[PDB]
Write a protein that binds this DNA or RNA. Structure first.
Ligand SMILES: Nc1ncnc2c1ncn2[C@@H]1O[C@H](COP(=O)(O)CP(=O)(O)OP(=O)(O)O)[C@@H](O)[C@H]1O
Ligand SMILES: [Mg+2]
Ligand SMILES: [Mg+2]
Ligand SMILES: [Zn+2]
Ligand SMILES: [Zn+2]
Ligand SMILES: [Zn+2]
Lengths: 65, 196, 84, 130, 559, 266, 160, 43, 138, 47, 114, 156
DNA sequence: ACTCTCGATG
RNA sequence: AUCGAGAG
């Protein structure tokens, strides 16, 4: 669907870090690890929360209704 | 269930305070019992946990393909390079008391899937409901507010116990109990009982 | 025909099924506001009252034990031994 | 009062797959017919090889165990390592050799002697010093 | 068979089951909705008129309440639609169908109902959430885990039938089973492993934790036990605080291997007067064994005391285990380097032996055993060699394991897992087999197209040198898949044919019982056994005792 | 002062790394638990949806709306809706903020937390404002709209405890570690060969003295030094997280004391 | 085979003997062979035991085989159960099977036998022969919905 | 869906056993259990 | 271009298949698995990749070669009962009943075969921070 | 992502499960049982 | 469906008192106090602070079931010492230590940067 | 020697040398007549059948033969006086307790033991995984196989 | 020759 | 009513 607002495990806000993450992958041409590290995602649960997520809403918006 | 034939329902839900926690403050989303490991021999579950942990930390995608030369030793070394116990263990603290735990816990990310079998779709209870027309017995089905079949094996169990009155209750009052008239001569249900 | 009160071969002890049947019957009687032959002493549960009533042998029932031939031996609850 | 008093010489120490308790083997330096086997919490009171430990068996110093308050109370020990157990077997090797078996919460003990006032009683305080 | 021998009934329920450490053995966790649904008719008496009036005042939707009210005329009052649901003068003799409440006798059941312990009477404890909660130690007779299992619950409708349930079908009354003259229930899983971890001689417990565990026992006398250690620090052993759970007058004696009243390995078991003297408590003791602790407590103190014993032991051990913790990782499946080397060289010399036997057989020097083919002898030899290889490497891996090894700990406690599990996970999973024989030639003179024809080598006929830790090769994987496949097949077949056999047996011995003369007969009066069991004893009250007059020398007998 | 001691090692807007000295284990643990659950926070509890033509479901949106971090500074001079003598909610108990989004451009129109507009009267209290730690200043990405998709709704935020729902969680992860050298031996380490070479070394080891092999086991030692790191989400500053945690624990102890005072009534 | 044998001094001592196992069965001519002990010879076929040594030996062999099957898995069942089964199989005079060919041909009740396997045909032949049902069978009272003579109902309760 | 669109049904010596010739054509693991085990296969 | 052939079982009967392409070439790591050296030469075909012996449901299993086969079968059965996104157009379809996971996640440990099964695009489960431990006993 | 390969009958998606059969026009010899009068049978299913 | 309300973890129900003081019938001069709508957070702390008092013989808390937010606390003190006073002293001690901790943390926080 | 019998005599004895706290250094206040005639008269009470004719009595003695053998084996004069060192009170208590437990161990009339047996054999057959053994062999036995799969002859 | 749960089509 | 899939 869309990026989860907060991390399940601990509770850190990660919903505001999605777009930025994408930028850090395409604009600065970094790898996923360093991008996740720069966003302040040290714990691997939040790091998971962003890395593991799939943005499906973009495919959902492809319909006209 | 996990991805290795390790199914199971939820026993209880604990809040983050009651949950055990590592020194980093990381709390498990899920707790499974170790006894579901040696008898079933699902090593690939553990290896999945290790690989997923390393891939999580490094931010890469762990390759869990069948026939490859990826070994538990390499994954262990990679995990140690990130500053953790190479075997996935982590020193955790009891959530209730705050005191450490003696044995360290195999702790890490594992891909779990939610199966279609939920309790509120299974739960059922009937106390005197709709009956059938042909046999005058409780209808069949949860969706039809039906009763449960007291099978032959159940009857056998109640016989083994010796509870005769209970067996009579299940087979009369609990199900279909009918009063009929019998002729004292031929002994058939020919009787035209004009009551009142 | 019948079987005399003497020369009775059946077990002098009360079987668990006889106990369950007697306690069940008595509790069934108490459950329909029937006179209690013992001191309640706080007890209100008909089963428990029937149990205390059995412990004092204040139950006016009798067991007709059937033999496979057709014979039958009668054993009053007051006479039967309850070792269970 | 007191039931037994002697000085033993530790002949062997054996950590049988443990890390807090070791089985000790000693003998009396007075009687040439007296020996002792005893499970010892090394983590509390370390017992190396070739040591001369002073061993005492008492019956007192039932009621609930009050914490040592204050004290300001008769400890009746001033030892180093004190335990409390229960005798469960009186083995008679010979007429001149009588052995006893104590159980200190699992930490067993076999004392072989000759001349005893050790009856099958819950009272079994084991006091070791130096 | 479908409408007379067995038919659908009212006052029944069914739900997914779950385990609950804080429930008693003879209890059942019943969801609130089911409690409001299922009902029991209770006649208005001077003893309960107030309570029943309060229940009717609550009505449905609120537990505890009532569904219907039956009057003298026989008319039924619906307490959810009637206008007079608020004001009701309960007359003596009226029936009140109230919600199921606590300590109510219900029948807990799980299909397939193979034996009588599949239907047992439990005490109701109304609880939230939508699951049938049951004690752990009641898992064994029902044969039930919690990976989606569902159980049924039936409710009695009169005093006599609930008397039948409470006085005959009660769970404590079913602890010692007449099936194998032994207890069919015991301590399992966490409570088992834990009780092995607690009774170790290295396990000492300080003041606070001891106080907590002590208070955790409902049958506690409130008397603090004098610590096994006084100075320099007051400490209690696991055995010492566990002794509180065991009732007084309980004596248990069992010698294992080198149990010499001093037991250097802390094996065996001696418990004097409800106080464990020595030995590690595990499956042989607190399990469902013949002369186990449960059997003794049941036969001595009684069934109630034994169920409460289950409760106490579970509470204490689960508490200690909760604050001690126990796990299992891949590290518990990794033997040492040189150990794996000796394993590999063991498989190597095994394959070498098989190679030599093969070459010998091909040289027509193989002399067939009397009564079998040359080829059958060859097969037998090779199979035996590979099996010996798996067992050898497995025993090596087992020896290499430490006492801190979690898997080995669970094996020691008897909680779960065995030797072959360690053998296959850490060393070598061994030879795969189908229909008794090793992997046959599906293709012409070969098992797979990746092999040449007439290749009777171990790796060709389905030998797996690799362990689950190392990983299986494609061939090994496929062969193992064949084996497992046959496993599932014959499993389904087995449960089917057994399913039939059970019914046949039941219908055959259906009308057989003991009459009032200890004569086992049927509905025809035909004597099957003149004295039941040829002795007239109930199988429940029978224990394996030694006849020490049949053994020993004549001189020893005389002496 | 005179009792327990604090040593702030690191300090920032989001984190506080400090050392709790001279304290019992149970008090540190309880402080942690209170910091996690029992601290009042303002978060969305009611969602009234007027029009919703977006991809996401209604309660799907309402959920993440509930998880939006809101300003909870003056939350102590706000009141529980269950305690206020008003019908449903008011300005003394709840904070109402609207959300009106609509697809305008051909490109995807994102709906963030900055689009939330406070409607109710705050009357001075610093409250209700959605925390935006975002660099661009957008905040939590709530939804996405296509071309003609509209999302119009209203949010009533109420005072709540994280014990009731994790959305009212003021803190995220609380780091907690005592005795980095296992000198108390509260943990029997697992190993295959060497216990020390396998298990990594904690940072807090820099702040304590390593054991000597010549020294026996100190059996009369307890737990005094604790190493903590409290992280805040944004609703409440870290210092105020731990302080209101302490005050909450103290207050709920004082309620028990008060109960004892009350049970003396005839 | 290994074997426990009473030593002349008293105790039981392991005395190993040679035993001839065999694929194939013909008890009627092997036991009469000069050279072997004709009192200890045994076959896994309780049929031949029943035919040669009698119905009692067939009973013992049947129980031996059933018990062997139960204990082969490593389990254990009390004697009286298997003994009851074997007895009920051997009391008719021969070896009564646990199928529709065996005990279902007995002279019991019509309803009882009808409640297993061949249902309708049993009722037919019972209706043609005009049989009398004693109604003291379990399944019969189960059908009639009456309190069967089972445990609790194995007697009567009156008042004195 | 993917699994259901690539399924194999078989009516009616040992058709249930995973045969050697099933290598590379039929999945060795993916099959129902309890009843139609071995009969119902997947490509 | 005569680089790949279509072989059925009957023709498979008369060929010699190489498991890996490295089996055509003429001190080790004790960690890896013991693989038997190629004692055959006259190859005619070579396997594309052994992992292609599995089906769609089995290809989702991580390290299936490290599992007991019936467990792989069980997971192959239960994978069809997991929830997630079955189709992108689930909101414009009127199915009898459908279940869609709130926040789907592409597994941290995947298979090279998952790429073609579109599993990382349409996952069916979440990466849960799991802990193997005896806690409260629940 | 929809792969197709299914039909739509009355709005219901239908899948034709592949049916496994024995190949025709193939010559196969089979050994018969012991009580059987015939020992071997060479048969072929013509199509 | 059958899940209880969340606020039942901290909100007292109809008629449910906060504390339930019961005379322990086991050992003399003992008491069992039922704490409603509270968990380990309070229980462990109070119990740990009741062991500091050297005039307290016994002190132990337990949560009989995780489903319900409540715990029992058993206290046994020496003769001439009412256990309620031990509970009060423990509570006040806790409050004082917490207050001092708050003051200390504040003073330490006022000396930081960033 | 180890065989399933009613009444655990060992536990009764070890309960006797615990309830009365007898010391192993004190003469027993018993007599040869006490022990011998006591035990001999104890067997008279261990009743399974209660008829007054010869047949039922023979069936009785035949039914309690083994348990009486065990009884004599454990309650021998030498064993009672030297191994246990019981007193008069303790010995009488042991006797009464043995009689009681034996009377408890008797099967209750009405016990549907046919079904109990069928289940006691059927249920463990469900937990079952060179001649034919296991479930197929059980099926052969129950069906009374005209032609069993593995006919064997064990010749001594 | 065991209990359940859904769907489909007449 | 039948059939199909699935749960222990
Ligand atoms: N046709 C049938 N008849 C009766 N029961 C059946 C059945 N099909 C399945 N079951 C039940 O389903 C259960 C399957 O559970 P499994 O998980 O296969 C046992 P396990 O995992 O091997 O043992 P474990 O829990 O000891 O590790 C069986 O125990 C059986 O009782
Ligand atoms: Mg299980
Ligand atoms: Mg199950
Ligand atoms: Zn996180
Ligand atoms: Zn007529
Ligand atoms: Zn308000």
């Amino acid at each position: 669907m869309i990026v989860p607002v907060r991390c399940f495990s601990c509770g850190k806000v990660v919903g505001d870090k999605w777009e930025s993450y994408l930028n850090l992958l395409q604009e600065d041409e970094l790898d996923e690890g360093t991008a996740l590290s720069r966003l302040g995602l040290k714990r691997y649960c939040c790091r998971r929360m962003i890395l593991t997520h799939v943005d499906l809403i973009e495919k959902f918006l492809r319909y006209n209704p | 269930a996990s991805r290795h034939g390790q199914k199971g329902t939820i026993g209880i839900t604990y809040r983050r305070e009651d949950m055990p926690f590592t020194a980093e403050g990381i709390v498990p989303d899920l707790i499974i019992n170790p006894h579901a490991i040696p008898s079933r021999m699902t090593v690939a579950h553990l290896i999945e946990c290790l690989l997923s942990k390393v891939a999580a930390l490094s931010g890469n995608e762990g390759d869990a393909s069948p026939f490859t030369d990826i070994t538990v030793e390499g994954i262990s070394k990679l995990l140690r390079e990130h500053g953790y116990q190479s075997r996935g263990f982590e020193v955790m603290y009891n959530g209730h008391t705050g005191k450490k735990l003696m044995a360290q816990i195999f702790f890490g990310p594992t891909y779990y899937q939610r199966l279609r079998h939920m309790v509120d779709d299974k739960i059922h209870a009937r106390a005197r409901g709709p009956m059938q027309v042909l046999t005058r017995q409780p209808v069949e089905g949860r969706s039809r507010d039906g009763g449960l079949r007291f099978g032959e094996m159940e009857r056998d169990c109640m016989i083994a116990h010796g509870a005769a009155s209970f067996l009579k209750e299940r087979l009369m009052e609990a199900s279909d109990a009918f009063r009929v008239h019998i002729c004292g001569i031929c002994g058939l249900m020919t009787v035209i009982a004009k009551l009142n | 025909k019948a079987i005399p009160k003497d020369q009775r071969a059946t077990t002098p002890y009360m079987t668990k099924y006889e106990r369950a049947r007697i306690l069940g019957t008595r509790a069934l009687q108490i459950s329909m506001n029937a006179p209690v032959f013992v001191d309640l002493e706080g007890e209100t549960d008909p089963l428990r009252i029937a149990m205390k009533e059995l412990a004092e042998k204040k139950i006016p029932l009798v067991i007709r034990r059937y033999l496979p031939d057709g014979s039958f031996e009668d054993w009053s609850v007051e006479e039967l031994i309850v070792d269970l | 009062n007191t039931l037994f008093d002697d000085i033993f010489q530790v002949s062997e120490v054996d950590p049988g797959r443990y890390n807090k308790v070791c089985r000790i083997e000693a003998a009396s330096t007075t009687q040439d017919q007296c020996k002792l086997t005893l499970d010892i919490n090394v983590e509390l009171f370390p017992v190396a090889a070739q040591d001369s430990l002073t061993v005492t068996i008492a019956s007192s110093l039932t009621r609930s165990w009050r914490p040592p308050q204050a004290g300001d109370r008769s400890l009746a020990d001033d030892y180093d390592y004190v335990m409390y157990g229960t005798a469960y077997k009186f083995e008679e090797v010979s007429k001149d050799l009588i052995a006893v078996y104590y159980s200190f919460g699992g930490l067993l003990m076999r004392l072989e002697g000759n001349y005893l006032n050790n009856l099958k009683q819950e009272n079994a305080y084991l006091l070791i010093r130096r | 068979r479908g409408n007379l021998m067995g038919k659908r009934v009212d006052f029944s329920a069914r739900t997914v089951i779950s385990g609950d450490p804080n429930l008693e053995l003879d209890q059942v966790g019943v969801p609130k909705s089911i409690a409001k649904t299922l009902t029991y008719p209770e006649v208005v008496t001077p003893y309960n008129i107030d309570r029943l009036t309060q229940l009717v005042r609550n009505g449905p939707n609120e537990h505890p309440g009532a569904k219907y009210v039956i009057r003298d005329s026989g008319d039924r009052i619906d307490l959810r639609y009637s206008k007079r649901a608020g004001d009701i003068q309960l007359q003596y003799g009226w029936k009140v169908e109230r919600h199921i409440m606590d300590n109510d006798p219900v029948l807990f059941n799980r299909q397939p109902s193979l034996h009588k312990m599949s239907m047992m009477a439990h005490r109701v404890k109304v609880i939230p959430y939508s699951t049938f909660r049951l004690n752990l130690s009641v898992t064994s007779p029902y044969n039930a885990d919690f990976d989606g299992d569902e159980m049924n619950l039936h409710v009695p409708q009169s005093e006599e039938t609930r008397a039948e349930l409470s006085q005959l079908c009660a769970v404590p009354l079913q602890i010692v089973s007449p099936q194998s003259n032994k207890p069919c229930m015991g301590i399992v899983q966490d409570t088992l492993c834990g009780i092995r971890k607690l009774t170790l001689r290295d396990t000492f417990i300080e003041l606070d934790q001891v106080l907590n565990m002590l208070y955790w026992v409902p049958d506690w006398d409130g008397v603090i036990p004098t610590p096994a250690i006084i100075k320099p620090k007051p400490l209690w052993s696991g055995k010492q605080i566990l002794s509180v759970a065991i009732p007084n007058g309980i004596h248990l004696q069992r010698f294992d291997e080198g149990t010499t009243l001093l037991s250097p390995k802390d094996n065996g078991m001696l418990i004097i007067d409800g106080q464990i003297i020595f030995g590690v408590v595990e499956k042989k003791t607190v399990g469902s064994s013949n002369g186990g602790l449960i059997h003794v407590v049941t036969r001595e103190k009684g069934p109630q005391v034994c169920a409460k014993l289950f409760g106490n032991i579970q509470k204490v051990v689960n508490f200690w285990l909760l604050h001690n913790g126990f796990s299992t990782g891949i590290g518990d499946t990794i033997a040492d380097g040189p150990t794996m080397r000796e394993i590999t060289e063991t498989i190597a010399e095994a394959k070498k032996k098989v190679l030599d036997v093969t070459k010998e057989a091909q040289a027509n020097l193989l002399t067939a055993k009397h009564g079998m083919t040359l080829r059958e002898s060859f097969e037998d030899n090779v199979v035996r060699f590979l099996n010996e290889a798996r067992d050898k490497a497995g025993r090596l891996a087992e020896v290499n394991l430490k006492d801190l090894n979690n898997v080995k700990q669970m094996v020691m406690a008897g909680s779960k897992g065995s030797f072959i599990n360690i053998a296959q996970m850490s060393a070598c999973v061994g030879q795969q087999s189908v229909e008794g024989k090793r992997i046959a030639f599906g293709f012409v003179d070969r098992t797979l197209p990746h092999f040449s024809k007439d290749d009777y080598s171990p790796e060709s006929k389905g030998f797996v040198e690799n362990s689950y830790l190392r990983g299986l090769t494609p061939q090994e994987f496929f062969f193992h898949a064949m084996g497992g496949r046959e496993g599932l097949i014959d499993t389904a077949v087995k449960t089917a044919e057994t399913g039939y056999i059970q019914r046949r047996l039941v219908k055959a011995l259906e009308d057989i019982m003991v009459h009032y003369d200890n004569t086992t007969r049927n509905s025809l009066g035909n004597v099957i056994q003149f004295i039941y069991g040829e002795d007239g004893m109930d199988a429940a009250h029978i224990e394996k005792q030694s006849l020490d007059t049949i053994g020993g020398s004549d001189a020893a007998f005389e002496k | 002062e005179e009792g327990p001691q604090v040593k702030i090692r690191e300090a920032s807007k989001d984190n506080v790394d400090f050392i709790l000295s001279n304290v019992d284990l149970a008090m540190a643990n309880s402080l942690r638990r209170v910091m996690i659950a029992e601290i009042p926070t303002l978060a969305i509890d009611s969602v009234e949806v007027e029009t919703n033509t977006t991809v996401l479901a209604d309660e799907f949106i309402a959920h993440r709306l509930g998880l939006i971090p809101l300003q909870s500074m003056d939350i102590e001079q706000l009141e529980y809706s269950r305690d206020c003598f008003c019908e449903d909610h008011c300005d003394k108990c709840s904070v109402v903020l609207t959300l009106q989004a609509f697809g305008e451009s051909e490109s995807t129109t994102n709906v963030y937390s900055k689009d939330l507009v406070i409607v109710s009267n705050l009357m001075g209290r610093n409250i209700g404002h959605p925390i935006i730690q975002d660099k661009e200043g957008n905040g939590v990405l709530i939804c996405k709209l296509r071309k003609g998709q509209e999302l119009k709704l209203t949010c009533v935020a109420k005072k709540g405890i994280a014990k009731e729902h994790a959305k009212w969680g003021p803190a995220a992860a609380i780091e907690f570690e005592y005795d980095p050298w296992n000198k108390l031996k509260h943990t029997d380490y697992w190993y295959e060969q060497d216990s020390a070479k396998e298990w990594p070394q904690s940072k807090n080891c820099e702040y304590e003295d390593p054991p000597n092999e010549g020294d026996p086991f100190d059996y009369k030692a307890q737990a005094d030094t604790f190493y903590m790191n409290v992280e805040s989400v944004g609703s409440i500053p870290v210092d105020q997280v731990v302080v209101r945690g302490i005050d909450t624990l103290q207050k709920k102890v004082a309620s028990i004391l008060l109960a004892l005072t009350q049970m003396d009534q005839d | 085979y290994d074997r426990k044998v009473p030593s002349p001094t008293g105790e039981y001592v392991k005395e190993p003997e040679w035993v001839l196992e065999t694929d194939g069965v013909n008890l009627s001519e092997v036991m009469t062979v000069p050279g072997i002990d004709p009192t200890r010879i045994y076959t896994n076929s309780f049929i031949d035991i029943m035919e040669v040594l009698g119905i009692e030996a067939g009973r013992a062999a049947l129980y031996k085989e059933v018990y062997n099957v139960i204990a082969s898995d490593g389990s254990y069942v009390n004697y009286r159960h298997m003994a009851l089964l074997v007895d009920v199989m051997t009391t008719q005079g021969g070896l009564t099977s646990v199928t529709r060919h065996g005990f279902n041909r007995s002279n019991t009740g019509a309803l009882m036998r009808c409640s297993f396997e061949e249902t309708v045909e049993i009722l037919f032949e019972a209706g043609a022969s005009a049989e009398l049902d004693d109604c003291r069978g379990v399944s019969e009272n189960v059908i009639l919905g009456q309190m069967a003579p089972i445990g609790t109902g194995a007697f009567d309760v009156m008042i004195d | 869906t993917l699994s259901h669109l690539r399924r194999t049904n078989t009516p009616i010596a040992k058709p249930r056993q995973l045969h050697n010739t099933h290598w590379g054509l039929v999945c060795p693991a993916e099959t129902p259990e309890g009843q139609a085990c071995g009969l119902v296969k997947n490509l | 271009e005569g680089l790949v052939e279509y072989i059925d079982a009957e023709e498979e009967e008369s060929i010699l298949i190489a498991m890996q392409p490295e089996d055509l070439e003429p001190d080790v790591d004790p960690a890896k698995r013991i693989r038997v050296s190629h004692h055959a030469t006259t190859f005619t075909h070579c396997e594309i990749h052994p992992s292609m012996i599995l089906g769609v449901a089995a290809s989702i299993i991580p390290f299936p070669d490290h599992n007991q086969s019936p467990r792989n079968t069980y997971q192959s059965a239960m994978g069809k009962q997991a929830m997630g996104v079955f189709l992108t157009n689930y909101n414009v379809r009127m199915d009898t009943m459908a279940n869609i996971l709130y926040y789907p996640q592409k597994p941290l440990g995947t298979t090279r075969a998952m790429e073609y099964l579109k599993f990382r695009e349409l996952p069916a489960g979440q990466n849960a921070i799991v802990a193997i431990a005896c806690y409260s006993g629940y | 992502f929809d792969m197709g390969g299914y039909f739509i009958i009355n709005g219901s998606e239908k899948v034709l499960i592949a049916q496994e059969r024995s190949a025709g026009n193939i010559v196969q010899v089979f050994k018969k049982a012991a009580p059987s009068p015939i020992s071997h049978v060479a048969e072929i299913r013509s199509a | 469906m059958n899940a209880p309300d969340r606020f039942e973890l901290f909100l007292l129900g109809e008629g449910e008192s906060k504390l339930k003081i019961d005379p322990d019938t086991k050992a003399p001069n003992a008491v069992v106090i039922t704490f409603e709508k509270e968990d380990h957070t309070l229980g462990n702390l109070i119990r740990a602070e009741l062991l500091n008092d050297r005039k307290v013989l016994f002190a132990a808390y337990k949560v009989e079931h995780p489903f319900f937010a409540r715990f029992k606390l058993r206290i046994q003190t020496t003769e001439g010492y009412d256990p309620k006073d031990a509970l009060k002293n423990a509570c006040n001690s806790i409050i004082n230590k917490l207050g001092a901790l708050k003051t200390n943390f504040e003073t330490e926080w006022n000396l930081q940067t960033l | 020697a180890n065989w399933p019998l009613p009444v655990n005599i060992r536990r009764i004895i070890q309960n006797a040398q615990q309830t009365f706290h007898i010391d192993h250094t004190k003469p027993s206040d018993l007599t040869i007549k006490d022990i011998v005639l006591g035990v001999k008269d104890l067997q008279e009470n261990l009743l399974v059948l209660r008829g007054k004719n010869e047949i039922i009595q023979n069936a009785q003695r035949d039914a309690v033969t083994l348990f009486c053998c065990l009884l004599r084996s454990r309650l021998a004069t030498r064993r009672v006086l030297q191994e246990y060192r019981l007193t008069k009170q303790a010995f009488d208590w042991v006797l009464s307790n043995i009689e009681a437990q034996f009377l408890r161990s008797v099967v209750h009339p009405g016990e549907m033991v046919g079904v109990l047996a069928a289940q006691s054999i059927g249920e463990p057959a469900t937990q079952m995984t060179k001649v034919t053994s296991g479930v197929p062999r059980l099926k052969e036995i129950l069906n009374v196989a005209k032609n069993m799969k593995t006919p064997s002859l064990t010749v001594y």
